[PDB]
Design a protein around this ligand. Sequence first.
Ligand code: MNB
Length: 258
Amino acid sequence: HLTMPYVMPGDGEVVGVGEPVAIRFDENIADRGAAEKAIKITTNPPVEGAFYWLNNREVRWRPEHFWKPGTAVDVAVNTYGVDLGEGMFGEDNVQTHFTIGDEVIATADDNTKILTVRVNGEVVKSMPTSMGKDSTPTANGIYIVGSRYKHIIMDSSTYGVPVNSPNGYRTDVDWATQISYSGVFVHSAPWSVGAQGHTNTSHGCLNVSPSNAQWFYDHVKRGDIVEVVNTVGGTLPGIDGLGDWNIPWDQWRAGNAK
Ligand SMILES: *Sc1ccc([N+](=O)[O-])c(C(=O)O)c1
């Protein structure tokens, strides 16, 4: 009858302008109002924000617009002993303190097949890209940068197919930056450099050259933004995990505690 809260981002971290505050409990929360009342978020410079639940275990808090660089954020999760409903009580308190770094916004336009990275407003890279093919398109929308991997094996088991079976495969991938929980990454794709800037060839990921992928890995951080426009796909769900900014402010602010 105890549930532990876990808070992101990490204490002392510098994050990008799109990073939400996240509180994820290890059990489903029956009384969302009780949980929200127990979480106190302070910012400097002061800016208003609000809570929205992505599912029964995890609540997010963010402002209306992307954070101002330099903002310092204190999060007090004062859940110890709090009745979170159906006889579940908060097992402990948590806190975190973080700051916002440079504004880093990369825009991938399917009309041009270019991924343009802007750092504090300056165009710093114009990367040819190859996105998802028509049958497996990359969704449009605002994506938040998550984890980064120098090397990762992307294999067929992600789509339910065993690696050693006739249609199985496993691919060594370098410089992979996650931008959705649905499985979209910006990564090195040496095999498709000819297509990048011209044709979409992937299962949904943003293929770029080895040089550009390493640059992206080295210069982006958790909470930075990738925006995809003009693809034949739909829109990234607001509840993806890294899709929070796709929910309009009035819906987000109104919340879903009840
Ligand atoms: S989204 C994504 C990235 C890389 C690879 N890969 O196999 O190199 C895939 C895939 O085809 O499974 C998907």
